Write a protein that binds this DNA or RNA. Structure first.
Ligand SMILES: Nc1nc(-n2cc(C(=O)O)c(=O)c3cc(F)c(N4CC(O)C4)c(Cl)c32)c(F)cc1F
Ligand SMILES: Nc1nc(-n2cc(C(=O)O)c(=O)c3cc(F)c(N4CC(O)C4)c(Cl)c32)c(F)cc1F
Ligand SMILES: [Cl-]
Ligand SMILES: [Cl-]
Ligand SMILES: [Mg+2]
Ligand SMILES: [Mg+2]
Ligand SMILES: [Mg+2]
Ligand SMILES: [Mg+2]
Ligand SMILES: [Mg+2]
Ligand SMILES: [Mg+2]
Lengths: 724, 724
DNA sequence: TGTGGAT
DNA sequence: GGTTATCCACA
DNA sequence: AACCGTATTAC
DNA sequence: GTAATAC
């Protein structure tokens, strides 16, 4: 069932037949249609393939995707491998040219390297190179078949026999249809491969183990050492026909691309605005579509589709799940999406599909985006270069800490817990006035996490270590109480539980203790949570030792868990483990660039308007003259020229004058224009003051953060205790 | 697997317990969250329940959702059924306030009448009753939430001292949060129910057997008699807590409600433009989003999502499948959507999902929308009154016959085959000139269908009967030829096959014949189809009987099939069986409304412009006064007045004068404006003539159809034959 | 059997 | 990203 | 519309 | 034996 299905070739012929291993069933469709059916076979691969150098060995044979791969090859596996039993001469890996494409290239080549080495050794394993670009100056002129793999090959296609043409930028084999696929990547004549070889069994064995085995730090190190986080990778210039390449440099090249991408652009939040790229995109798109808190809800599907076609070239479920998460107030301390309908529960029951639900940005999420229009924040091109997207949001509140971030990259993970908005702002304000402020002091203002699930946080000294180093283990325990019953009889009653825990799975594990009678005294386990409150009720027998039970539960269930801080985020393009200080200063530095840029923006604006008001005031005093002059001019350009020569209007002033609608001659109040002149001069002064004086700027940073606090502050939810 | 999964209630109190039956798992969850877990259980339904008449038993008693329905209630199957054993004292059917809500209500009430009567007579089966509207908005501490079931209760809530606060118009249970759901339709206190009774076994064995039994024609008849297509049905006002209705007026209203909707607004094409509503909404949406043939492709999920949030409240796969079909050139004779990627194949291998594919309208699809921006067509309010959509498209070509339509409805279906564009035009064009033209005459121009898949149509008479009455059975036969082989051998070479036949499945069924040796002579079946060409070779044994084989294949496989014209369409809102004539006159009448409407639009434009230009030419001669006048005036609107009163300009002319930019005063060339008068006056003449002179109009209708023909004509694909 | 818009 | 059900009318 | 797999870090 | 963005 769980394997991808095989489409054979028509002819049994080991000497020239090909098995295409294709990324995903959709692309298997296109491959199955563009193929030559007599010597080309197809096995679709169902997303990410197992790791045969992490996962076990019973696992590796239960893996259906593997078993069907071994089957179809018809050679045997590892210690039973015969090369002349094999049904194909070429095993051809063919993936999207996305970076997960690279990840799959990686994952296969290990399996094969490890369990089919003579097949790798005899150079039977290849890789298909799909194109990146397509060029057409036709469609009823004729067409102009033209493709490109390198930005260099593309720049060559500014020639060909036509211009003003199109350039389709491919994002998968999904977007290619049979004819496109045959020519470009499947037809022996035209297609372009690479053969995978073994140059050095030492240097190539080594490369795999580090990259693909479960030692995380040699991997982190390989990434530290090899990956350029701050640089591009001016790629190879695509040799014709086939091209030999070491397993070594491939597992290298490919895993470097995958590692880098998921570190920078997937699983790790940016240190300033606290968003993963997918989440930033949700916010930006839903903002641009005016899907804000003040206006109407909006079908989730519409939202998700726009996000996927404009910014985020990934699956719809990835986006809907991300959007939905931002809407749940047991995951986010401050929700960035409001959403009508079923957005799940704490029992983790599935949210309603995006066809049902509807949604819009939360009020506070407007503040992450505040002043994005005012050139505060560096924009870059979307995946196809139709449209720009922000690399980071203004962030008028310190989201990273408030809402935290839990993610898993390559060579790195991250747990940052949520915090109280007020508390986080208090620290930051202090640090604005005290650059060198140290933990002990900051912790007067930010004592610890504030989970939206509430609960009891235990381990003040481990908080400190996490706030210093970025790592530390703290304890979270459910809010419990006792209640009496008839028959005397007590019952334990749970109202808050640990963050990231599934209520139904917890109730079940508890009840499994009762059933297994691991600790004497439990009668019934009842979930009594209605829509308004959480309320698990553990009912004990007649004279049960209330507190001995409670203890086994904490110990041996998830009624108590340890939260583990591992605070990683992206500083200056790079993954970084970080405590409260770099986080808070990073933010402050960010708000500084924003307030400064917003001020320059607003100021250049105000000056233009001033220069015009200046001109319009003068015009009124010579209005007859100005009109007679426009009447005596030949055209628009002439008039402007006359106005400058005869009256010294600037270009800007003349253009504005020349384009006043006639009805504007009704409003000629010079007193009212003067009032406006005053207001502009003052605005410019205030804005020049900010730009001119760090402290004038910092005091505004603080003024704003205080307003945000006042507008959005809510009580702590999790109580802090010291002993553990 | 398969069946909606049960969520038990906490204590077994069959005195007061309630099994809620909820349309879908997404709403199932919402109900779960919103319930009182003590005495309310939740069985969700996975959409359409089996019909308990139609579906004959054994299939019924393995139907997973049915098993898990009887299991739950813990009573039995009418005969063994025992009210006293039952786990619930109310079975409450809860469905979307939608029209499939109605169909599902309908489907269940058969199962209860027909295998569980005692529950229904006793009054233990109830109904749902979600609200249709929610009103108001007034901060946080709110002062402004009330709901609404009827149109009548809307006037009620519009009345609130404050201002006009915001209105939600619910589209199902998947847009309702669990508080909203408990409070409005699940709390016994506040909820409102319909108790289902049996008020005469007689009038609810006739009513339940007509509506849901095998005989189409009584149901067709019932609808024909009872259902008012051209008329609304807003009636029943909302009463006190519980209300009574009989199993008659429930069945009646609900299946009537349903059948109306899916006859009109789903499964049957409109006779003018040949479109089902989803297809028209696809076109109109994509078109309005500038997603046209001339601009570049665009992610499918973006198009689909905008269709669903704007026009079509239904499933994304229902929408995407329709879109994919319109792109498939073996289902449509003139594709309306161009889709890049895996858009299926003839073997019916699944198309890539909407995240992979991208798409835009074909060029000819633009001709269905031609002149839509010129008030050429009635528009309605969309499903939530945020936007407007066309009830019918301009249809600059006769799409209904050209692409045909295959649909299934209630007490009605529709098979219309596709025709060749050029031939359909030729017949319409003749019939413009000869309204009383007979079939034999039209059939000179339009002899029979033209399938995209081609093949051989045999049966001139039944073609003629279909073209007369709307019904008729024709033979579609695959195109074949015989090819010699090595050493006294033959093979059959299939090169075209019948419309709607999956090639893979056919090749399968032919191979199965060989395997079982139903007829003798078959060596091998080889699908030799590739990207460029269709080619099935059936390779015969030495001295087999090519004829006996072939004719056995035509007979017992789908290498030849029967096509049954069942030409049904919507004419004046009612379903109607039609032949060529009422089809072609429907179109000609439409193009008439369109050409006229359009011409009035373009003429209103040109008069406005002309009048303005008159006013401008005048203005020159009083320029100094107009200027003096406009400076004097207190404001814009004031200065317009003074222009009218003082100088005798229309509103139109004054508004244009008053919004001239100052630089227009440089232009005193009346001559260019006079050439423009001239050209405008001529244009208005051409236009007004079309409006005044029926023939002038028709000659245009003809000119234009001829242009379409010439631009889009393609050779016939199916050959015709007359008898065998 | 299977068509094609729906749950 | 495959997979699994139902309804509806008509061979 | 639920249900199934994988990579990735890290308890 | 789970978290959360990806195939
Ligand atoms: N056939 C293919 N499927 C997937 N894929 C995508 C999912 C998504 O878009 O969210 C998903 O949720 C998903 C779940 C699965 F359980 C799953 N598998 C069960 C096994 O059969 C594999 C797979 Cl594979 C899944 C893919 F990304 C690519 C595919 F080709
Ligand atoms: N859970 C529910 N699912 C459906 N539903 C919707 C589908 C769609 O919108 O494209 C679909 O393709 C689909 C396929 C199925 F095979 C299927 N079933 C197999 C059985 O488990 C039912 C169901 Cl049910 C299906 C529904 F319309 C409503 C639902 F609640
Ligand atoms: Cl101005
Ligand atoms: Cl003008
Ligand atoms: Mg991809
Ligand atoms: Mg998924
Ligand atoms: Mg524990
Ligand atoms: Mg609905
Ligand atoms: Mg479906
Ligand atoms: Mg037949």
């Amino acid at each position: 069932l769980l394997s991808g299905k095989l489409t054979p070739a028509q002819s049994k012929n080991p000497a020239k037949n090909e098995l295409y291993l294709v990324e995903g069933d959709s692309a298997g469709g296109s491959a199955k249609q563009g193929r030559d059916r007599k010597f080309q076979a197809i096995l679709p691969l169902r997303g990410k393939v197992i790791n045969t150098a992490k996962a076990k060995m019973a696992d590796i044979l239960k893996n259906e995707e593997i078993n069907t791969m071994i089957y179809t090859i018809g050679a045997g596996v590892g210690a039973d491998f015969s090369i002349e039993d094999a049904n194909y001469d070429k095993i051809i890996i063919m993936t999207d040219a996305d970076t997960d494409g690279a990840h799959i290239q990686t994952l296969l080549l290990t399996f094969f390297y490890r369990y089919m080495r003579p097949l790798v050794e005899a150079g039977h394993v290849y890789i298909a190179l799909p194109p990146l670009y397509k060029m057409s100056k036709g469609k009823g002129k004729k067409e102009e078949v033209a493709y490109a793999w390198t930005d260099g090959e593309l720049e060559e296609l500014r020639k060909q026999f036509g211009k003003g043409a199109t350039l389709q930028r491919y994002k998968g084999l999904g977007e290619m249809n049979a004819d496109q696929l045959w020519e470009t990547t499947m037809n022996p004549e035209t297609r372009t491969l690479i053969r995978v070889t073994i140059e050095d069994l030492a240097r190539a064995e080594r490369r795999v183990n580090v990259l693909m085995g479960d030692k995380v730090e040699p991997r982190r190190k390989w990434i530290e050492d090899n990956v350029k986080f701050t640089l591009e990778e001016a790629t190879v210039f695509h040799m014709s026909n086939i091209q030999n390449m070491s397993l070594e440099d491939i597992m290298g090249e490919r895993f470097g691309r995958y590692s880098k991408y998921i570190i920078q652009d997937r699983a790790l939040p940016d240190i300033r605005d606290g968003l993963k790229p997918v989440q930033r995109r949700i916010l930006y798109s839903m903002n641009k579509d005016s899907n804000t808190f003040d206006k109407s809800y909006r079908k989730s599907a519409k939202s998700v589709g726009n996000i996927m076609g404009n910014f985020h070239p990934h699956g719809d479920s990835s986006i809907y799940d991300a959007m939905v998460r931002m809407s749940q107030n047991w995951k986010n301390r401050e929700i960035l999406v409001e959403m009508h309908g079923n957005n799940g529960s704490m029992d983790g029951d599935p949210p309603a599909a995006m066809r049902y639900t509807e949604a819009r940005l939360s009020e506070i999420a407007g503040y992450l985006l505040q002043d994005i229009e005012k050139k505060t924040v560096p924009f870059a091109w979307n995946f196809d270069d139709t449209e720009k997207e922000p690399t980071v949001l203004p962030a008028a509140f310190p989201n990273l800490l408030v809402n935290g971030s839990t993610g898993i990259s390559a060579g790195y993970a991250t747990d940052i817990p949520p915090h109280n908005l007020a508390e986080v702002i208090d620290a930051a304000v202090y640090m604005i006035d005290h650059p060198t402020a140290k933990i002990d002091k900051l912790m007067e203002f930010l004592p610890g996490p504030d989970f939206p699930t509430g609960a009891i946080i235990q381990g003040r000294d481990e908080i400190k270590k996490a706030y210093e180093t970025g790592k530390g283990r703290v304890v979270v325990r459910s809010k419990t109480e006792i209640e009496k019953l008839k028959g005397g009889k007590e019952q334990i009653v749970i109202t808050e539980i640990p963050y990231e825990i599934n209520k139904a799975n917890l109730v079940k594990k508890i009840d499994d203790v009762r059933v297994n009678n691991k600790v004497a005294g439990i009668a019934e386990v009842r979930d009594e949570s209605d829509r308004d409150g959480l309320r698990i009720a553990i009912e004990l027998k007649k004279d049960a030792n209330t507190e001995l039970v409670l203890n086994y539960l904490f110990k041996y269930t998830d009624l108590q868990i340890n939260y583990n801080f591992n605070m990683v985020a992206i500083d200056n393009f790079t993954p970084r483990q970080v405590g409260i200080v770099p986080i808070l200063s990073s933010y402050i530095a960010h708000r500084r660039e924003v307030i400064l840029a917003r001020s320059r923006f607003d100021k250049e604006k105000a000056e233009k308007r001033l220069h015009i008001v200046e001109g319009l005031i003068r015009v009124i005093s010579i209005l007859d003259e100005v009109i007679a002059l426009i009447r005596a001019s030949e055209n628009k350009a002439d008039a402007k020229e006359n106005l400058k020569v005869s009256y010294d209007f600037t270009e800007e002033q003349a253009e504005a004058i020349v384009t006043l609608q006639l009805y504007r001659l009704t409003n000629t109040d010079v007193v009212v224009l003067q009032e406006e002149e005053a207001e502009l001069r003052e605005k410019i002064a205030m804005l020049a003051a900010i730009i001119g004086d760090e402290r004038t700027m910092y005091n505004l940073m603080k003024k704003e953060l205080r307003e945000v606090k006042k507008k959005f502050a809510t009580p702590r939810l999790s109580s802090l205790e010291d002993t553990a």
